[PDB]
Design a protein around this nucleic acid. Structure first.
Ligand SMILES: [K+]
Ligand SMILES: [K+]
Ligand SMILES: [K+]
Ligand SMILES: [K+]
Ligand SMILES: [K+]
Ligand SMILES: [K+]
Ligand SMILES: [K+]
Ligand SMILES: [K+]
Ligand SMILES: [K+]
Ligand SMILES: [K+]
Ligand SMILES: [K+]
Ligand SMILES: [K+]
Ligand SMILES: [Mg+2]
Ligand SMILES: [Mg+2]
Ligand SMILES: [Mg+2]
Ligand SMILES: [Mg+2]
Ligand SMILES: [Mg+2]
Ligand SMILES: [Mg+2]
Ligand SMILES: [Mg+2]
Ligand SMILES: [Mg+2]
Ligand SMILES: [Mg+2]
Ligand SMILES: [Mg+2]
Ligand SMILES: [Mg+2]
Ligand SMILES: [Mg+2]
Ligand SMILES: [Mg+2]
Ligand SMILES: [Mg+2]
Ligand SMILES: [Mg+2]
Ligand SMILES: [Mg+2]
Ligand SMILES: [Mg+2]
Ligand SMILES: [Mg+2]
Ligand SMILES: [Mg+2]
Ligand SMILES: [Mg+2]
Ligand SMILES: [Mg+2]
Ligand SMILES: [Mg+2]
Ligand SMILES: [Mg+2]
Ligand SMILES: [Mg+2]
Ligand SMILES: [Mg+2]
Ligand SMILES: [Mg+2]
Lengths: 209, 53, 202, 102
RNA sequence: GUUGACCUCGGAUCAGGUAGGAGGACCCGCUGAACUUAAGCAUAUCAAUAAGCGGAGGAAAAGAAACCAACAGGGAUUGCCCUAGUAACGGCGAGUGAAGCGGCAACAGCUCAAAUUUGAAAGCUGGCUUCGGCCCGCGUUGUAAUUUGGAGAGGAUGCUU
RNA sequence: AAAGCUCCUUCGACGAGUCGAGUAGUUUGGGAAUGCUGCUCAAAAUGGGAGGUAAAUUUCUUCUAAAGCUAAAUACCGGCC
């Protein structure tokens, strides 16, 4: 029933909801369990970082396409441009994704530079310590200060473009001919009439001869 | 038994120093196997074909 | 090879050469037991495509099923309910006839593991299938990494749960917007959408 | 490099400008092409196996002149307008070859 | 005529093996209600729930796109937060109700069929064994190596492992 | 003996009573019909599926079905602590 001025209620409590109720009294306990696992995992990968290298990628809709984030893995064309064989890459801490493509030059150039920055900071220990190979670090450079995150050392430096800048006066540009508002109205109008105008031109030319 | 004898002769030749193809010659046999023979027909290498009924 | 030609010829089920063969064989079966063993596959190309090999530990069985709908078994025709579910006749079974064949063969040979099955024949009263099975205790099977994954105890009676090719189809395990309700398990998904989760700092 | 975008939303080739590039095709995109082996085999099987009952009925309608009947019959059998049209073209090619060779 | 094969089907307290029952809180399927709400009641709701039947494990299931999208494009599966009591369904009544994008926890990839080893079935179960192999058998109606679309095969070329 | 990389004229096999269509029942938020199953019909080679309003004509985008394996983050106090 209803008796006063109310908002019409819709509470979905007509099933046996009390059989499926999940409280979380183990929130602090599960946090301790996760930290112990991370600490154990880091110790197993002794000098290596605890992560993999990811590429930079742009979000997909008209909302969010102004921002960039990290993706799944590097493409096969990016790896070839840097000069890293595809079989070697996943064994030195680099992720690979075989189903992403480079439709532009902007994304390709950004990720190629990312790979060769990483390759310059890499230290390779030989498979057998008494017989080093010419592609390994010659062990005088094996001692340095290292990083073990790879998500803070190679993160997204700036996800958004700068929101403000300054130019000298008299260098400001001139507007479009009729004005910005009129340009938008004209672009919309042309799209709504592309089919009508093409048909009119076609029947005119056919009836011409 | 013939193959085991042939491999022994070849192994002895290698140990002595000579390679194979100096002790064994080119073989001639009858071909068989359904997939093997169908391919020989398409490449036009067979001379005569006999089919079970 | 020769199995390429067989795959093409098996598509022409309405030709003269193929119609004759199907008619003759459908009579030969139906003179035998409902479930019986076959000495070799009658469709060599189709069985090889599904995983059959010609070595010790692979066996073939043949079976036929009743080929119709499902009548609701109730005393006479009374259901004792509301009018919306008092139909008896035109109802259908949610699994395939191909599935029922695999289950009955699995009970006959309960020391083996069911791999796959395929269609061989049909008529007005029966459909006919051939089922592929593997011996998990044979030495030549446990030796091969391409197949010994089936010797592990998590694959006991796959066909009773829906882990074969025909079971996956009836469960609805495909990607995309059409398979929204069944993609990861229908009953699991329903439970997730109907759970009330309360955190400490609400 | 198909076309260059205008640089504004709400247009005919709207969108942000970017230097597009052409890609070599992935091997996954070859699915529908023909090959020498698959043509040779399908040719031999058709000679051995022959025609189907519904195919023979369409053959007679086509060489008898009727075409709306042949198209309307094929759609009822095969199911869709697109498949029916392709079938009638193939059978018409068989008719032409048979009466042209000898 | 004799003798010797092949194919299919059988016997044996033949040699060696394997399944059933229990448990079922959680997991994978099948089958399937009514009380109740609608201030009556038949579509609806309760509910794709209770009861009934079959099958597993320490987790199970799912899983490396015949996906999402319409962007300057994302990129196997699972779970939390948000999307959202929203698009939509409904005697359009009572009532019901998802998904893409976004942040995070955790991250890992692969193997078959379809090709002639054809200058050599290169493959495998079992028995006996100084231990090195030998013998029958399976198998050409196809057992190994090679290839899986991200490719690859076939040619050049000279460095590396 | 086996393995990786750089280039190339030419080749480049890819799962059928399956997909798809009609009709009946059930189910879903899925609406000229979201999935499943029964019956009837039944394919193709740049072919095929999808692109949330039925149909014809012309374009475009994106994947590659009808064979298979696989740890972690998730559930549970039934069993032993
Ligand atoms: K009842
Ligand atoms: K009903
Ligand atoms: K009702
Ligand atoms: K015997
Ligand atoms: K309990
Ligand atoms: K029960
Ligand atoms: K939103
Ligand atoms: K051998
Ligand atoms: K092989
Ligand atoms: K149907
Ligand atoms: K297409
Ligand atoms: K559409
Ligand atoms: Mg917390
Ligand atoms: Mg045998
Ligand atoms: Mg699985
Ligand atoms: Mg699947
Ligand atoms: Mg294509
Ligand atoms: Mg005994
Ligand atoms: Mg039991
Ligand atoms: Mg109650
Ligand atoms: Mg009432
Ligand atoms: Mg009352
Ligand atoms: Mg009453
Ligand atoms: Mg129950
Ligand atoms: Mg146990
Ligand atoms: Mg776990
Ligand atoms: Mg599993
Ligand atoms: Mg794939
Ligand atoms: Mg994409
Ligand atoms: Mg994903
Ligand atoms: Mg809100
Ligand atoms: Mg809500
Ligand atoms: Mg409901
Ligand atoms: Mg190789
Ligand atoms: Mg090569
Ligand atoms: Mg395929
Ligand atoms: Mg039901
Ligand atoms: Mg329906």
């Amino acid at each position: 029933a209803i008796k006063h001025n109310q908002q019409i209620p819709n509470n979905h409590f007509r099933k046996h909801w009390q059989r499926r109720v999940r409280c979380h009294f183990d929130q602090p306990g599960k946090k301790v369990t996760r930290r112990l696992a991370r600490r154990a995992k880091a110790a197993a990968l002794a000098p290596r970082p605890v992560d993999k290298l990811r590429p930079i990628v742009r979000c997909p809709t008209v909302k969010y396409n102004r921002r960039t984030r990290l993706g799944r893995g590097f493409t096969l064309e990016e790896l070839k441009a840097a000069g890293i064989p595809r079989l070697l890459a996943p064994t030195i801490g680099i992720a690979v994704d075989h189903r992403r493509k480079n439709l532009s030059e902007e994304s390709l150039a950004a990720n190629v530079q990312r790979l060769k920055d990483y390759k310059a900071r890499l230290i390779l220990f030989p498979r057998k310590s008494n017989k080093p190979k010419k592609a390994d670090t010659p062990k005088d450079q094996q001692t340095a200060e290292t990083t073990t995150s790879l998500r803070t050392s190679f993160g997204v430096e700036q996800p958004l473009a700068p929101g403000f800048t300054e130019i000298s006066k008299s260098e400001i540009p001139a507007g479009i001919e009729g004005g910005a508002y009129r340009a938008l109205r004209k672009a919309r109008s042309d799209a709504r009439l592309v089919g009508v105008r093409e048909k009119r031109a076609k029947e005119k030319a056919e009836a011409e001869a | 038994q013939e193959k085991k004898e042939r491999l022994l002769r070849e192994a002895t030749a290698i140990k002595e120093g000579k390679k194979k193809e100096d002790v064994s010659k080119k073989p001639y046999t009858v071909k068989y196997g359904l997939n093997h023979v169908v391919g020989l027909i398409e490449n036009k290498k067979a001379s005569l074909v006999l089919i079970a009924n | 090879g020769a199995l390429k030609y067989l795959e093409e010829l098996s598509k022409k089920k309405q030709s003269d050469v193929v119609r004759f063969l199907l008619r003759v064989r459908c009579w030969e079966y139906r003179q035998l037991n409902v479930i019986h063993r076959a000495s070799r596959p009658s469709r060599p190309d189709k069985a090889r495509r599904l995983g059959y090999k010609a070595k010790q530990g692979y066996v073939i069985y043949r079976v036929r099923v009743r080929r119709g709908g499902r009548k609701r078994p109730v005393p006479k025709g009374a259901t004792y309910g509301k009018p919306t579910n008092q139909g008896v006749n035109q109802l259908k079974y949610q699994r395939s006839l191909r599935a029922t064949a695999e289950e009955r063969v699995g009970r006959r040979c309960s020391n083996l593991r069911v791999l796959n099955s395929y269609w061989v024949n049909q008529d007005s009263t029966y459909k006919y299938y051939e089922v592929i099975l593997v011996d998990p205790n044979h030495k030549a099977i446990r030796r091969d990494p391409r197949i010994n994954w089936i010797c592990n105890p998590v694959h006991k009676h796959r066909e009773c749960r829906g882990l074969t090719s025909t079971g996956k189809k009836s469960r609805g395990l495909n990607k995309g917007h059409r398979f929204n309700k069944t993609r990861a398990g229908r009953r699991k998904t329903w439970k997730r959408h109907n759970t009330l989760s309360l955190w400490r700092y609400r | 490099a198909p076309v260059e975008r205008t640089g504004l939303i709400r247009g005919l080739n709207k969108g942000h400008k970017t230097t597009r590039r052409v890609l070599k095709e992935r091997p996954s995109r070859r699915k529908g092409a023909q090959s020498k082996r698959t043509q040779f085999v399908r040719s031999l099987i058709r000679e051995v196996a022959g025609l189907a009952p519904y195919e023979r009925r369409v053959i007679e309608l086509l060489r008898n002149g009727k075409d709306k009947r042949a198209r309307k019959f094929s759609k009822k059998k095969l199911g869709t307008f697109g498949r029916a049209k392709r079938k009638c073209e193939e059978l018409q090619r068989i008719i032409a070859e048979s009466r042209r060779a000898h």
